[PDB]
Amino acid sequence: SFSQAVSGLNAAATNLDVIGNNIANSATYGFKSGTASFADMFAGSKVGLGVKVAGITQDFTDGTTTNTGRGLDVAISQNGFFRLVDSNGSVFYSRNGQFK
Amino acid sequence: SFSQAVSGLNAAATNLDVIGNNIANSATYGFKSGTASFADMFAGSKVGLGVKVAGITQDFTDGTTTNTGRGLDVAISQNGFFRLVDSNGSVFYSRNGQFKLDENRNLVNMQGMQLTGYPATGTPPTIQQGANPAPITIPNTLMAAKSTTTA
Amino acid sequence: VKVAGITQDFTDGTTTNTGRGLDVAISQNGFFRLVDSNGSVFYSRNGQFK
Amino acid sequence: VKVAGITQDFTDGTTTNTGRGLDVAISQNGFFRLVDSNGSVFYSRNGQFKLDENRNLVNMQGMQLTGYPATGTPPTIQQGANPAPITIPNTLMAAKSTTTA
Amino acid sequence: VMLPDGTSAYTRDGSFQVDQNGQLVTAGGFQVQPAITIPANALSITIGRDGVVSVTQQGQAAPVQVGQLNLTTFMNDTGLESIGENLYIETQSSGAPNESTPGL
Amino acid sequence: GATAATFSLSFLNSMQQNTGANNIVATNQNGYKPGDLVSYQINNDGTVVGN
Amino acid sequence: YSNEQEQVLGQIVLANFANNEGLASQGDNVWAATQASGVALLGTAGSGNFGKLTNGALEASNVDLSKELVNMIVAQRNYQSNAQTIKTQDQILNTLVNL
Amino acid sequence: YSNEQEQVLGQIVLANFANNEGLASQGDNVWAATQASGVALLGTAGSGNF
Amino acid sequence: GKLTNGALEASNVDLSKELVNMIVAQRNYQSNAQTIKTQDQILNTLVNL
Amino acid sequence: GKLTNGALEASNVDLSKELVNMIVAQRNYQSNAQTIKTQDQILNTLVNL
């Protein structure tokens, strides 16, 4: 059956895209790496229909704290999230502490 | 006649499908490889009518234990199965250790099934093993104070 | 000979990811229930909804 | 012409490792002895043995592997006993009071 | 199998279906003895080597047996008279129907 | 309240010569505490052994 | 907690079966108990027939791709041989029909 | 919605049949209930036999 | 946790692990492509019958 | 949605999945042509009889 090989190829492509995105953000303040989580999709029969990506899990571990010398950059240690609002009143959260 | 080669082709296709499933799950935590089991199909005549797929057998051997550094990744070395419950209350078993703390403060896996275990009752709370397993929850409920009784 | 019947094979097919939020796939048993303009009741496993 | 018969080729095959503790193969001559649910006795060279619900050693089709049982304390292989289906009990193994030191 | 007349026919074709009432019938719509009824909420049907029919229900820790499928043998197989629809009936040259468990 | 174990203790094969110092070579006993099934295996000669 | 005091909230239970191969895979890398697998024996890690838990680590799959990429080759060859047998029987039937 | 509040608009119902085969297919990957298939048993997804 | 002034928190992406995972994922992708090729040859063999 | 200035929205076509779908559709087309050929042979036998 083509379905299992196609699903495996799609999962490998998703994992490779996640790895490439993590690489592209190696130098990006407030970025947390991601990892794809895979699960099999047995359906009735015992032939192992294929694989699927159950989701993408973040890695919320604190990064290295680098001094910059400016007084308006604030780094956050341990748990916590900086709270921001856009022009339309929506509430958002970020670990990036580069302010002006 | 035809049925002999038909059964042979079907068995080969099933074997190839099992191999493809194993390859597609090359990187899947808690996955066990599968292997097809074949048997003869003699019926009266000695010509050997054909072959049939007796079943699919898993290889329940321990995989590599890879360090991730999270505090909700737990791996079962040697024998054992994590016990999970879905929304219907059906009991399932899995070797995966990717547990996440959901909004209701329960320990659930990636797909949302709740991890089960022996609960703690009393003051001070202790694990009472005489009870049936219940979903594990981690409330923020502030802990009350205990006036001293022994110093 | 006589055609005794035309029987279906109701085994679950592969669940293929597409990425559309309006698409629903049925695992295990169950059917989607639909009605046309005439009120006739129909059942379908196809989950491509718009 | 007349088909005289069908002759089997009883030559030893390749021994491929699998890593399963219940998986065993016969080198040289010899056959595994199995018993069906109706008591009929069979012989087979296939070694895919698995533990069933009732703690008996059965192959894929459900035929119980047979052999010499163990009796006594400590138990010993009774070479004079008739072959019986092999069972691996999980029952608690009791303690033995010390007799010789 | 039970004919609509109440008499018993005998078939070897095994493609069985379930009618609207939940019972086991032959693909020609004829109800196969013994009366083996499959419930509405059945998840999987397991028919063993000895004809023991079982079903597993949701939320039930044990499989449930819903009947026992038996096999009928004749001392003279050729004498059976075909009535079509893959069905044989018993004649006086086909001996008498001997019910037995599948493996006995 | 359990029955005391009565056993035959033997110092056989022991010896008294000009060794380094008084030392025990070996001790053995045939009793054991209750144990539950941990593993099972099929030996080379065909015996099934449970550990 | 913040008062320098620990509280237990639950203990992970582990299930072991008489027949692991009798478990029915339901997908989502999850197994289901069945009559062939036997009733689940519950217990605690590190006691009886249950292995210890490694915290902060994940159990990877046991699929060896070198072995699978070999197998696939063998199964392809067997499948093509069976197709050759099919075509041989086809030519046989054509020969008999052409009479 | 935009007021950080959500509103349930329905629940998709699933149908299960006593004889899945007796269904008479009308095309357009759509089935129709038939006397052979029996009446449709309605329920919610992920519960009971659904 | 407290706030550190005059400092920024960098990403927690280690390049070595990312490169090794990229290598492994490339190999897995090629294995799946080999499976696809196997099924292609099987189907071609059947059609050529 | 939001407008981003100085940027263009590229297509959402992924080449890998499209190539795989092309392969599968080729196999389906060849199987259907085989069915056509089979029907062409049955009518030949009858016409000739």
JSON list of C-alpha atoms in Angstrom, two decimals, chain D residues 36 38 61 63, chain E residues 49 102-104:
[
{"chain": "D", "resi": 36, "resn": "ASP", "atom": "CA", "xyz": [-4.09, -29.88, 19.70]},
{"chain": "D", "resi": 38, "resn": "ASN", "atom": "CA", "xyz": [-8.70, -32.17, 20.99]},
{"chain": "D", "resi": 61, "resn": "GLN", "atom": "CA", "xyz": [-1.92, -21.72, 15.80]},
{"chain": "D", "resi": 63, "resn": "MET", "atom": "CA", "xyz": [-1.01, -25.99, 19.73]},
{"chain": "E", "resi": 49, "resn": "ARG", "atom": "CA", "xyz": [-11.65, -23.16, 15.52]},
{"chain": "E", "resi": 102, "resn": "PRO", "atom": "CA", "xyz": [-16.23, -28.52, 14.76]},
{"chain": "E", "resi": 103, "resn": "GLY", "atom": "CA", "xyz": [-13.22, -30.57, 15.86]},
{"chain": "E", "resi": 104, "resn": "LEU", "atom": "CA", "xyz": [-15.03, -33.57, 17.35]}
]
